[PDB]
């Protein structure tokens, strides 16, 4: 019964032979702070308790980093606007940005830049924060988000960490979906829906180690579906399919935030390591063009095979498991029927995070939710879609009242107040917003509790069992999509000894120590690559990346050169008048802020510029095929097919070609390239070269399947329903479906 507290600041108190925490220091004991009450009386009693600019300031999140003191050389202590945020703007919420790893050496405090730190000092940065969030006058505790962490960067494979003190590295999402669908494969002959243990397994381990650094609350996991191959965040997306995305949401929600739910329905407990806000709700996947709304050309949603409701399935999953909170957004549902509404009726044409229609009607009202909304980052002022002409002010009224309960990247309580004394926000909202945002902090138990042993997340965090899992999950995320029948047999598993040639991210004296002579094709472009004749085996590391760093809206070289072509996107606005540059016939930067220039402000600066967030040029965004990518402008392949086709060559018979291929996105294998030439091609999603080479030596066999196709021709990539997995609607069809993978057989 009775909970283990902490306090730092304020006292612990007696009452009828318990401890409690005085935190008003009234002298004596609140309902708020009585833990043997309901949460609801406890929420109640804090709201009333309360003045508006405190209730206020639970409206607003950002980023609160750890530093370290250039003078001590101490790393993870208070930074510069902590005292500001708490104390002044009376946050509770906040974004933890640092890397947390072992240090290199010679490593010095810069006094700038975002410092890395060790669980050790992460926890004691996160600690320092709540022991000044309990000296606040009701002392209420805060809470940390961060976006995922323990996601090898299949472009960094060569710092992967192998050792502690940095979170256990696990593939990509997807990867995990492949090991997923291949473990059902393996156990039952069937790729559908996943076997959930590996998910539940590597969001074990991610929840003990978030926990132990005092970091309980994610930006993810990410619901949205890959069914659109030409958005660049299919990165993040574990599946195309909804059924399969719908089963790792539950298994998440479960596994990180509890399967004990409230009465209020939702799985917050003191045992909650991480409570998930996912996103993006209803559902980004289903990009027209695959151009993201975080950029004017890319505002649109389109539904062509009527699936939104399908892609708001894992959301409902996830609601129903108990998701503590929820993320819009900002893309606009074009033409889209209200679900559960009169016929005819479509969603308003605005970004999702401004539709009452969409965050409280649909959420709230269709979808069981009962917990917070919070908004995305970097979208209120900049972003506010179908809103160009509105205020600042209207769009964060409009986000609130459409159901939006707190702000991210906020961290000025007066934009809440100025917008309560103009009367746009009524002070019943702001308090029903500071119900739902106290919720689970009084059922996560940080009102009883807030603090973490840092002695112990320095044990925790990358223990060598917590790894060892994240090495399971790599080998079987691997997806072997094509290994060639040669005389002398098929060309994986790899022979004992031989010369190889290694080309890309590849660790030669792991390579090396399984036996191999090793040359490394990898040569600074002034010096000269050795050639690759008479090598047994071939290894090429390949993936694209965009450089489309240079895109400008307004420039007529770029976003406005006519010579680009015109966006096919048409929103109708509210009024029934095209959205500027979504007429379907505008220059690409038209529909950016910068040209139209709507808005209260008459010289705006472009949105788009520098396309800073990701994704190609937007006339570029169709270019998927690896011999496209290699001409495009906007697209790197990475190494250059130049120089994988010369290494093709340089070989006696291509079939000694294997190649290790990161599908950041549904990159397509076309016959132009010469690629399926290869002896084996595997989709990696990031692994070790351990990982990768215990495979392909055949210490372990391959097992993952595909959780998205992939498609064979750039028309298939055309022709695809944006809103639609696979390609069985496209005149070419797939290269390869959902669920394939081969594996040996001896
Ligand atoms: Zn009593
Ligand atoms: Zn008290
Ligand atoms: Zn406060
Ligand atoms: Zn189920
Ligand atoms: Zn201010
Ligand atoms: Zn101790
Ligand atoms: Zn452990
Ligand atoms: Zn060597
Ligand atoms: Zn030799
Ligand atoms: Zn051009
Ligand atoms: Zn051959
Ligand atoms: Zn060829
Ligand atoms: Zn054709
Ligand atoms: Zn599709």
Known sequence: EQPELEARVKEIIEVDGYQFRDLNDNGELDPYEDWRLPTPERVADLVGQMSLVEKSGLMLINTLNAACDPQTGEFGVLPAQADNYINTQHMHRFVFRNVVDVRAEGVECTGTGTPVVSPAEAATFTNAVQEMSEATRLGIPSLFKSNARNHIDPDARVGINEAAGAFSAFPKEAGIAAAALGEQARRTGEATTGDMSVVADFADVMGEEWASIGLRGMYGYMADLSTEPRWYRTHETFTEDAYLAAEIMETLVQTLQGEELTDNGLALSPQTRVALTLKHFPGGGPQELGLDPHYAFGKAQVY???????????????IDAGV?????????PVDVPVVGG????????????????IVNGLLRDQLGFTGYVNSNTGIINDRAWGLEGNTVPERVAAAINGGTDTLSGFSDVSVITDLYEADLISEERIDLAAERLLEPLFDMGLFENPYVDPDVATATVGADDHRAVGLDLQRKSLVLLQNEETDEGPVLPLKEGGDVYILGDFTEE???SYGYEVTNGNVAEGEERPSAAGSDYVLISMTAKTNAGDYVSDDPSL???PDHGTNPSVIIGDDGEPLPGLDGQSLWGAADVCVHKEGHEENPSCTDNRLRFGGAYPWESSILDFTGMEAAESWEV???LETIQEVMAEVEDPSKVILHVYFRQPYVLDEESGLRDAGAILAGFGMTDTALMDVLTGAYAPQGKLPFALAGTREAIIEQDSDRPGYDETEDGALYPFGYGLTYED
């Open 342 to 357: 009169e016929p005819g009726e479509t969603y308003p044409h605005t970004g999702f995070a401004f539709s009452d229609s």
């Open 510 to 512: 792991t390579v090396e």
């Open 638 to 640: 990475v190494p250059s």
């Open 324 to 332: 503590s909170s929820i993320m819009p957004y900002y893309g606009v």
């Open 304 to 318: 062509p095979a009527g699936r939104f409701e399908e892609h708001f399935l894992p959301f409902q999953a996830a």
């Open 559 to 561: 976003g406005l050169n």
